[PDB]
């Protein structure tokens, strides 16, 4: 659940 | 376009939520108004009866 937040804040920052 | 597109979504959703809440606000306010504008009709009719009761 930590990783699907780390890899979906990055998708919004891109 | 990552945060521009999400920004578009976020702003749209706030704006939809607020228009629908404005129509709901309008319904509450009209039902209260109904309660108010019925209170005015009652005491103009009562004093009408008071007036012709005084003739007697």
Swiss-Prot record, chain A:
It comes from the Eukaryota. Disulfide bonds: none annotated. It is found in: Endosome membrane; Golgi apparatus membrane. Glycosylated. V-ATPase is a heteromultimeric enzyme composed of a peripheral catalytic V1 complex (components A to H) attached to an integral membrane V0 proton pore complex (components: a, c, c', c'', d, e, f and VOA1). Subunit of the V0 complex of vacuolar(H+)-ATPase (V-ATPase), a multisubunit enzyme composed of a peripheral complex (V1) that hydrolyzes ATP and a membrane integral complex (V0) that translocates protons. V-ATPase is responsible for acidifying and maintaining the pH of intracellular compartments. Is present only in Golgi- and endosome-residing V-ATPase complexes; enzymes containing this subunit have a 4-fold lower ratio of proton transport to ATP hydrolysis than complexes containing the vacuolar isoform and do not dissociate V1 and V0 in response to glucose depletion. Belongs to the V-ATPase 116 kDa subunit family. Present with 1084 molecules/cell in log phase SD medium. This is V-type proton ATPase subunit a, Golgi isoform. The gene is STV1.
Curated annotation (Swiss-Prot), chain B:
Coiled coil: none annotated. The modification N-acetylserine is found at residue 1. V-ATPase is a heteromultimeric enzyme composed of a peripheral catalytic V1 complex (components A to H) attached to an integral membrane V0 proton pore complex (components: a, c, c', c'', d, e, f and VOA1). Subunit of the V1 complex of vacuolar(H+)-ATPase (V-ATPase), a multisubunit enzyme composed of a peripheral complex (V1) that hydrolyzes ATP and a membrane integral complex (V0) that translocates protons. V-ATPase is responsible for acidifying and maintaining the pH of intracellular compartments. It is found in: Vacuole membrane. Present with 2280 molecules/cell in log phase SD medium. Belongs to the V-ATPase G subunit family. It comes from Saccharomyces cerevisiae (strain ATCC 204508 / S288c). It comes from the Eukaryota. This is V-type proton ATPase subunit G.
